[PDB]
Design an enzyme around this catalytic site. Structure first.
Site: not given
Lengths: 69, 138, 321, 253, 284, 77
Positions: E70, E74, E115
């Site tokens: 966890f 972001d 990505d």
């Protein structure tokens, strides 16, 4: 549906590109360029002087017009 | 009827007139035993075989596999076969032999081509650079 | 075995089965094959779609004896420095290509047997058209979008060119009433299809009357974006005995229902009138005249080489995929 | 740019050993034979060449097959099913447009149903612990080729595949890669293993002598094998048709 | 609204942060997705502080459970919260330090990310930032791979001009875009479609040609009918940024991939040899 | 030609039994170490404090789904 773009330019020409939905898009000729009569028959709404000046191969459904200053 | 064809050294092979009719030369000739001194019997028999397999034909580019396997032989007889097909002027045979040679040339470099075809190179070491210059836009 | 002993017609028959890259490659083997790489029967039909290239390269290639030269949307932005002999090209496509005025003048100053031409989108001038006057055999021509030349140039070109079958002198963005007047005054007499769209404030009923009274053989016609054509122009077209496909799209001065009267011209087949007909009333016009085709094809055909990579029905054999 | 080439080389050298399968595994299994491993890999390369796949797909598929059989008992009727699953996994990992599960359940003449393949997939992912990025010889070959004629590489890859057809499972993939590269180089032009490769991988000719002679004798005996699917595949000009060349009788070590 | 259920587990651990990630599995169609396999295999192979760790893989009959590590926040929401005050420069430098370290690790272990975007970067409440979204990762050995890549706003001109080989210099370009929008809080190249993206990139950096980019006029999708734009002022591109960063950006957003600095080359830059370690300023 | 049989059909129900028994390893240790019923998607007694954090808090990555008139002029829009 017919989406327009702003005007961006260099010192000599002023440009614009236009995105079209699928139904109009599937009519664009792959061989020759167009003329004002032609794309008005398609359904563009703009002034006198805009010239269709190239085709971008990966995405045919985008048109590119330019006109002088 | 039939006709007796004699090769460069006497191997008289009798063949139906309707088969030799493929050879345009012989066709216009029977219009008005014979030696064909430009063809040895070895190639001649293969020519007869090709005509027979094609005797009732209608009358890239999809070389018929029968001819393809018929063509699975080396340089020398391929050379001689092309020359004989010309000399007798039979359309399709020369067509397919030409196509076979074309495809076998396809792809290889000038050095490989020169080696395999036994071509004597000339005017080199100063002009190949120029002729390559004549080929950038490729 | 000595394959160099092969005879020339056999070698040519062999080489008539290749593709342009390999045909170029084999040219560098031995001097005889170098000669035979260019024998004016291999170079019938060229194709250089979109490929960038150089004036000397194209000059050499054309001098080799090309007939149908298809080079659309290719870029030739370098000066030509070499001279040649009068070319042998008969069909030339150059649509939309970015070329220099001097280079184009130099290239065209050699071709004289042009049976079919295209110059869409380009820019021309007085020396170019003066040189182009020599082509006394032009079946077709196409000058859409071009701009720069003068009235004396236009009249001289149209006078010299006699057999002109179809003409597409459309959409040019510098014309004048003088230009269109002298055009219709000197247009040749065999024009089967003609386009004169765009020239909104320069097309007048007098000039259209001059056209319809001089040329009796119009079969396809368009006058789009003309804002001074009235129903008198209507009866003008009624004198035309072969008009099969008319298109007055976005001609504002025309009241929609007089379009019904167009159906009364016998030999009509299609009528593209985009812009004027309000929607739904298209069904009204269809019911008024159901023996036609209204708004069934958006795109022109007046001297367009390609509408299908084959130029004008000809096939290009030497290509680059 | 060599900004990562040596680092990846060292990394692969370290990884090739952790996933090294057991050698004597084949005897432990009750009903399968090395002849049968050859038959499976033969049919497998046949099917792979059918669907127009890549060779690294086959490399990883046979590596998964080896690492699986070395840890699980199985009846012979399930070998084709396991091989199809392994090829499907390799295609999903490496290949761009993977042939679908329908094609693989079809090519088996429908001797198996789709759900059986799915459950085998569950099982093989379970036992393999989801570590499928194993190194293979082909990467070593390609790295070596950087220091190059198309025929040389075609022959080298040919020899590598010949090696995977059947004492090589004792040698490392790097070992077999070096052996095949050097022997193909000698066969095509007679040149020898240059110094820079010895500096790179640390491998010398002397270390690879045993696998070198194993590869040489297998090269000699290959043209007369009972199965020539690799040979007929390499009869095409895409691989330059080089499968028909003569095996050199004795090296000049 | 906003469907989903997620679980946590916090008992006794330094890295007590964990989170469960379930993915639906349709049994009778293609089986396990290629993305899942690529992510799992390429992820349980890498270990690093600047990369999210995986703890275990739970493969049920119809569901996959992944015990991820966890983390708090972001970067999208983090910039949005401080979109008016800006971000402290040393914080940017430390974040870029961790990012470049992670990039060097990934490219050393033969894995492409492909990505990178500020929605796939996660920061901790102490200044550590880690990457994620290895679903587009693939083990490169350079061949021709899949020709649909990261995202229009962060692609590189290599792919936009439809090139055939896109070796591991695209992530560098994506990192350049992300760092620039970090500094200026403005996405450098907010494209509408691919052609608009090319025109924006040109107008910012001038039209490419042979001199700047060797072998550009031979790309599949080059047409000299392009606008003739010239390279504008680099300082005005990113105003609040110094000279050293201006240089680093200049060799970090260069056209030619071979003339584009790699990870380890960037690790030794002056602007970058000065490294601090701050902590985030807003709630995570 | 590739469509060939290697060994003909063999029983498949015993295959299902064998594969499921092989898979019957990941049921004890799952509850042992992780104290979670992954098969039923349910938490357990604890030692791993199971909560339900709402999607508005954690970054979206943890739940991201996989993949006469009619003038010829310009009227603006």
């Amino acid at each position: 549906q017919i989406y327009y773009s702003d005007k961006y330019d260099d010192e000599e020409f002023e440009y614009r590109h236009v995105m079209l939905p699928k139904d109009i898009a599937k009519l664009v000729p792959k061989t020759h360029l167009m003329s004002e009569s032609e794309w008005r028959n398609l359904g563009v709404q703009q002034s006198q002087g805009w010239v269709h000046y190239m085709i971008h191969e990966p995405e045919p459904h985008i048109l590119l017009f330019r006109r002088p200053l | 009827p039939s006709i007796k064809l004699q090769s460069s050294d006497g191997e008289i092979f009798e063949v139906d007139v309707e088969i030799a009719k493929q050879s345009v030369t012989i066709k216009t000739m029977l219009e008005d035993p014979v030696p064909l001194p430009n063809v040895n019997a070895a190639i001649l028999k293969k020519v007869i075989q090709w005509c027979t397999h094609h005797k009732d034909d209608p009358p890239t580019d999809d070389i018929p596999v029968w001819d393809q396997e018929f063509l699975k032989v080396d340089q020398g007889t391929l050379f001689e076969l092309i020359l004989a097909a010309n000399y007798l002027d039979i359309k399709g045979l020369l067509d397919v032999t030409c196509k076979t040679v074309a495809n076998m040339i396809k792809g290889k470099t000038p050095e490989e081509i020169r080696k395999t075809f036994n071509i004597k190179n000339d005017f080199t070491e100063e002009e190949e650079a120029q002729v390559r210059k004549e080929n950038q836009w490729c | 075995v000595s394959w160099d002993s092969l005879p020339d017609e056999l070698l040519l028959g062999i080489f008539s089965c290749l593709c342009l890259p390999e045909l170029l490659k084999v040219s560098g083997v031995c001097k005889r094959w170098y000669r035979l790489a260019s024998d004016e029967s291999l170079w019938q039909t060229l194709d250089l779609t979109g490929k960038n290239l150089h004036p000397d390269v194209t000059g050499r290639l054309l001098s080799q004896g090309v007939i149908a030269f298809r080079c659309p949307r290719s870029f030739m932005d370098q000066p030509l420095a070499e001279h040649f002999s009068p070319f042998r090209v008969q069909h030339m496509d150059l649509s939309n290509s970015v070329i220099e005025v001097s280079t184009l003048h130099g290239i065209l100053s050699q071709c004289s047997k042009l049976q079919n031409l295209s110059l869409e989108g380009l820019r021309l001038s007085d020396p170019i058209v003066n040189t182009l006057a020599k082509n006394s055999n032009l079946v077709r021509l196409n000058l859409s979008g071009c701009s720069g030349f003068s009235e004396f140039a236009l009249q001289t070109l149209l006078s010299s060119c006699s057999r002109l079958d179809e003409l597409n002198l459309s959409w040019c963005f510098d014309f004048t009433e003088k230009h269109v007047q002298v055009a219709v005054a000197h247009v040749s007499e065999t024009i089967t299809q003609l386009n004169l769209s765009g020239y909104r404030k320069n097309l007048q009923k007098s000039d259209l009357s001059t056209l319809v009274r001089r040329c009796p053989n119009l079969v396809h016609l368009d006058l789009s974006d003309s804002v001074m054509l009235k129903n008198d122009c209507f009866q003008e077209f009624f004198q035309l005995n072969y008009l099969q496909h008319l298109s007055l799209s976005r001609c504002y001065d025309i009241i929609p229902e007089t379009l019904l009267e167009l159906g009364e011209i016998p030999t009509l087949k299609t009528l593209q009138v985009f812009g004027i007909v309000p929607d739904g009333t298209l069904q009204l016009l269809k019911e008024a005249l159901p023996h036609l085709q209204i708004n069934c094809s958006h795109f022109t055909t007046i001297a367009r080489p390609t509408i299908n990579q084959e130029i004008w029905g000809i096939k290009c054999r030497l290509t680059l995929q | 740019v060599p900004d990562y080439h040596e680092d990846i080389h060292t990394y692969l050298r370290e990884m090739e050993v952790k996933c090294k399968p057991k050698v004597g595994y084949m005897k432990k299994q009750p009903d399968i034979t090395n002849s049968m491993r050859a038959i499976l890999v033969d049919w497998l390369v046949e099917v792979g060449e059918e669907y127009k796949l890549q060779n690294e797909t086959l490399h990883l598929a046979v590596n998964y097959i080896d690492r699986f059989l070395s840890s699980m008992s199985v009846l012979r009727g399930k070998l084709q099913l396991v091989g199809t699953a392994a090829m499907l996994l390799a295609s999903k990992f490496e290949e761009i447009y993977p042939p679908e599960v329908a094609e693989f359940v079809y090519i088996t003449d429908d001797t198996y149903t789709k759900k059986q393949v799915l459950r085998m997939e569950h099982l093989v992912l379970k036992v393999l612990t989801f570590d499928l990025a194993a190194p293979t010889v082909n990467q070593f070959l390609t790295q070596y080729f950087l220091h190059a004629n198309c025929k040389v590489e075609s022959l080298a890859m040919f020899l590598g595949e010949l090696s995977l057809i059947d004492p090589y499972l004792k040698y490392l993939p790097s070992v077999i890669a070096g052996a095949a590269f050097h022997l193909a180089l000698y066969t095509v032009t007679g040149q020898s293993w240059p110094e820079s490769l010895i500096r790179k991988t640390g491998y010398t000719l002397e270390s690879l002598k045993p696998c070198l002679m194993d590869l040489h004798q297998t090269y000699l005996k290959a043209p007369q094998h009972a199965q020539q699917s690799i040979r007929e595949k390499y009869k095409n000009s895409k691989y330059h048709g080089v499968s028909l060349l003569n095996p050199p009788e004795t090296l000049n070590l | 609204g906003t469907y989903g259920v997620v679980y946590k587990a916090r008992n006794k651990l330094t890295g007590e942060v964990v989170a469960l990630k379930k993915i639906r599995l349709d049994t009778e169609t293609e089986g396990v997705p290629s993305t899942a396999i690529r992510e799992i295999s390429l992820l349980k192979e890498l270990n690093h502080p600047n990369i999210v760790k995986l703890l275990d893989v739970i493969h049920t009959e119809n569901k996959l459970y992944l015990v991820f590590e966890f983390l708090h926040q972001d970067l999208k929401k983090f910039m949005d919260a401080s979109a008016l005050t800006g971000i402290p420069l040393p914080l940017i430098k430390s974040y870029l330090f961790q990012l470049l370290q992670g990039l060097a690790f990934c490219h050393s272990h033969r894995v492409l990310h492909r990505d990178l975007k500020p929605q796939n970067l996660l920061i901790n409440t102490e200044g550590a930032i880690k990457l994620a979204d290895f679903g587009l990762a693939r083990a490169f050995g350079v061949r021709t791979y899949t020709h649909e890549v990261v995202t229009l706003w962060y692609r590189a001109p290599e792919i936009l001009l439809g090139c055939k080989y896109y070796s591991t210099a695209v992530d560098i370009w994506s990192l350049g875009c992300i760092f620039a929008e970090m500094v200026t809080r403005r996405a450098l190249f907010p494209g509408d479609s691919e052609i608009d993206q090319l025109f924006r990139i040109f107008r910012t950096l001038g039209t490419p040609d042979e001199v700047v980019w060797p072998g550009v006029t031979s790309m599949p999708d080059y047409k000299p009918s392009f606008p003739k734009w010239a390279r504008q002022d680099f300082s005005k591109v990113v105003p609040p940024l110094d000279e050293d960063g201006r240089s680093l950006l200049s060799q970090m957003l260069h056209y030619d991939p071979n003339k584009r600095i790699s990870a380890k080359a960037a690790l030794a830059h002056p602007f970058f040899q000065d490294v601090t370690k701050p902590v985030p300023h807003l709630r995570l | 030609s590739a469509c060939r049989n290697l060994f003909g059909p063999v029983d498949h129900e015993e295959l299902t039994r064998d594969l499921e028994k092989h898979c019957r390893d990941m049921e004890e240790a799952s509850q042992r170490k992780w104290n979670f019923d992954f098969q039923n998607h349910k938490p357990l007694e604890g030692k791993y404090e199971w909560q339900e954090v709402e999607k508005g808090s954690l970054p979206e990555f943890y739940y991201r789904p996989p993949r006469a008139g009619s003038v010829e002029q310009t009227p603006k829009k």
